[PDB]
Structure formats: structure tokens, C-alpha cells
Design an enzyme around this catalytic site. Structure first.
Site, PDB file in Angstrom:
ATOM      1  N   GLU A   1       0.828  -1.209   0.000  1.00  0.00           N
ATOM      2  CA  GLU A   1       0.000   0.000   0.000  1.00  0.00           C
ATOM      3  C   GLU A   1       0.868   1.268   0.000  1.00  0.00           C
ATOM      4  O   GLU A   1       0.955   2.008   0.981  1.00  0.00           O
ATOM      5  CB  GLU A   1      -0.989  -0.036   1.183  1.00  0.00           C
TER       6      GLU A   1
ATOM      7  N   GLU B   1      -5.853  -8.048  -0.673  1.00  0.00           N
ATOM      8  CA  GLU B   1      -6.563  -7.888   0.591  1.00  0.00           C
ATOM      9  C   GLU B   1      -8.031  -7.608   0.319  1.00  0.00           C
ATOM     10  O   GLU B   1      -8.363  -6.801  -0.555  1.00  0.00           O
ATOM     11  CB  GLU B   1      -5.996  -6.742   1.448  1.00  0.00           C
TER      12      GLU B   1
END
Ligand SMILES: *[C@@H]1O[C@H](CO)[C@@H](O[C@@H]2O[C@H](CO)[C@@H](O)[C@H](O)[C@H]2NC(C)=O)[C@H](O)[C@H]1NC(C)=O
Length: 304
Positions: free
Chosen positions: A132, A239
Site C-alpha cells: 500500500e 486484501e
């Protein structure tokens, strides 16, 4: 099956982020191999295992490996892959090292050589450039992903897949807004997969057990899918989670439905998350008790 992959994140070694290096069993912990076996027993075949960059190579990212932290970490990686499942090696760092955004492609590439050397002969390992990237310039993010690739391959880790990640927490719903420059990534071995995250709560932060709607999941991955179909890339949803309620479950089912129908771009997904310290966590996939384990594992197993 519907997908090439389907699994779970196994959190623990990245907890206590406020405490570097931290101490195992207090700040952080490693994933329970027995608990991973149960999810293997259930039909899961890929496991993403977060870790902190600063704990793996302290002080500087051109530095040496922490022996202790690397052996705790490898023991789990070698358990996953020794059972014939893929292990995703995930420096869970948001494009920052000791809190500063990473801006040295050559240092980031040195980091990845050192790390990927210790796994170069394990074909079941997957390398995840960073978890991320956010609030950094798009060019820098792209170059870091290209740096990781270069250090991985030059370390001889040439058969393993490489998961690359976009800016803006690499969310699927914002991908065509922030991460169109990620087409320009190359890999001599040609095993790039674009790893995107998607949560279903209002801001997409995945901190709530409430979904916006029973269609918000598929609505948030359509744009990203045509980008992969158009530019001929592969994707994995690295995710994803929903709360234990009907609306969320409907939205996860509808998103996974859409992904599985587009198997030709989407190689699979991984739940967020399993691991031995989640306890009460609204998304815990950890057996025997985890809230997601009871509610979602029966659902997800339809896609294995
Ligand atoms: C690792 O996971 C296993 C499997 O869930 C856990 O073993 C359980 O432990 C509790 C008590 O400690 C028992 O209620 C279960 O019967 C055990 N199941 C087994 C052995 O299959 C184990 O505790 C976990 N280890 C951790 C979290 O450190």
C-alpha cells in the site's frame, strides 16, 4: 475451482509498528503454523505474510539481515511453501522506511536483492514490492516497483511471481484514477501480477464491519478489471474483507463472482486476515474462533 489462488493474509510479524525493532511476544508475533495448516486443510493455497522492513534489515535498507527476525519469518514461509502453497513475502510498509517515504530506487533495489537472495530457489515464494504505497508521487511509486523487480531478478530470484502495488493504498476502486502509469513496468521473467486491495466500508479503509451496499464490492472492482483486460495485465486482490452480516457477505459474494467470471485477468484473492493475535477482530480468519472464519470461510470455500 474458480481462481488460480485463494488464501488469507497471516498477520502478526508486522504488529506493534510503533515499536522498532520491538520484541517478539510483546510487540509482535509470528503466524501459527498449526493454524495455517487448518486453512490449508480447508483448501487455501496462497498465504500473504506481512513483516516490517525495519525489523528485517535494521538501520538502513542497504544493510544486513536481522538473523532472529528473518528466521522467525522464514520458518513460516518455509512451512507454507513446504506444504506446497505459495507464500507472499510482504514488506508491510506503505512505501515508507522508518516513517520516511522511500525515494532511493537504488536503495530499495539493494533491499530487495538482499531479501530475495534468501528465497531465490523456492519457486513457491511470491515477492510483494511493498504494502500500500500512498501519498507519494506516482512516478516515484512506479520506479520503486521497478526497482524491486530489478533487485529480485538480479539476485537470481527468477522463477517467482512478483506482486506489484499501486499508489493510493493500491485500491481497486481508485486504480484508473491514480495508477494508470503502472502499465510501464517490465520484468525479464514476465511474471508481474498487479495486486490490488478492496474494502467495502464507506471510505474503503476496511476498519468497519458495515458495508455501503450489497453491490458495492462488484461496483468497486469493475473499472480496475477493464484496465487489466485492456492493457493485458494480470491481477490478484491481495486484501479484502467484509463484516459478519448479510449485506457484506452479499457484497463479497458479488465481487468474488465478478472476479471469478473474469478469471482471465484475476488470478485470485486473499482474505484480510488470519493470524494468531487478532482475537475479537471483526475480520479474523484465524481458526477456531475468528469471526470471519465462522461466517466467511463457508462462503469463500465455494471458490476454491
Ligand atoms: C495454534 O493453532 C492451534 C490450532 O487452532 C491451537 O491448538 C489449540 O489450542 C487450544 C488450547 O491451547 C485448544 O483449545 C485446541 O484444542 C488446540 N487445537 C489443536 C492443538 O489442534 C494452538 O493453541 C495455536 N497456538 C497458538 C495460538 O499459539
Amino acid at each position: 475451482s474458480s481462481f488460480e489462488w485463494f488464501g488469507s493474509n497471516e498477520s502478526g510479524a508486522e504488529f506493534g509498528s510503533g515499536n522498532i525493532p520491538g520484541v517478539e511476544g510483546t510487540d509482535y508475533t509470528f503466524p501459527n503454523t498449526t493454524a495455517i495448516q487448518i486453512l490449508i486443510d480447508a483448501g487455501m493455497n496462497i498465504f500473504r505474510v506481512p513483516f516490517l522492513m525495519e525489523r528485517m534489515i535494521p538501520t538502513e535498507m542497504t544493510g544486513s539481515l536481522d538473523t532472529a527476525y528473518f528466521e522467525g519469518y522464514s520458518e513460516v514461509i518455509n512451512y507454507i511453501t513446504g506444504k506446497g502453497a505459495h507464500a507472499v513475502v510482504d514488506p508491510h510498509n506503505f512505501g515508507r522506511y522508518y516513517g520516511t517515504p522511500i525515494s532511493s530506487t537504488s536503495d530499495f533495489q539493494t533491499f530487495w536483492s538482499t531479501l530475495a537472495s534468501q528465497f531465490k530457489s523456492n519457486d513457491l515464494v511470491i515477492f510483494d514490492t511493498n504494502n500500500e504505497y500512498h501519498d507519494m508521487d506516482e512516478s516515484v511509486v512506479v520506479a520503486l516497483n521497478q526497482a524491486a523487480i530489478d533487485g529480485i531478478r538480479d539476485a537470481g530470484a527468477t522463477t517467482q511471481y512478483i506482486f506489484v502495488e499501486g499508489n493510493a493504498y493500491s485500491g481497486a476502486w481508485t486504480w484508473t484514477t491514480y495508477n494508470t502509469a503502472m502499465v510501464n513496468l517490465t520484468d525479464p521473467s514476465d511474471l508481474i501480477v498487479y495486486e490490488m486491495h478492496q474494502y467495502l466500508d464507506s471510505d474503503g479503509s476496511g476498519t468497519s464491519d458495515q458495508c455501503v451496499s450489497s453491490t458495492v464490492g462488484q461496483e468497486r472492482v469493475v473499472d480496475a478489471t477493464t484496465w487489466l483486460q485492456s492493457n493485458g495485465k494480470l491481477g490478484i486482490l491481495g486484501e479484502f474483507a467484509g463484516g459478519a452480516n448479510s449485506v457484506c457477505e452479499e457484497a463479497v459474494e458479488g465481487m468474488l463472482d465478478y472476479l471469478a467470471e473474469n478469471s482471465d485477468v484475476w488470478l485470485g484473492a486473499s482474505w484480510w486476515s488470519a493470524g494468531p493475535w487478532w482475537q475479537d477482530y471483526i475480520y479474523s480468519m484465524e481458526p477456531p474462533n475468528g469471526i470471519a472464519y465462522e461466517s466467511y470461510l463457508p462462503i469463500l470455500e465455494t471458490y476454491f
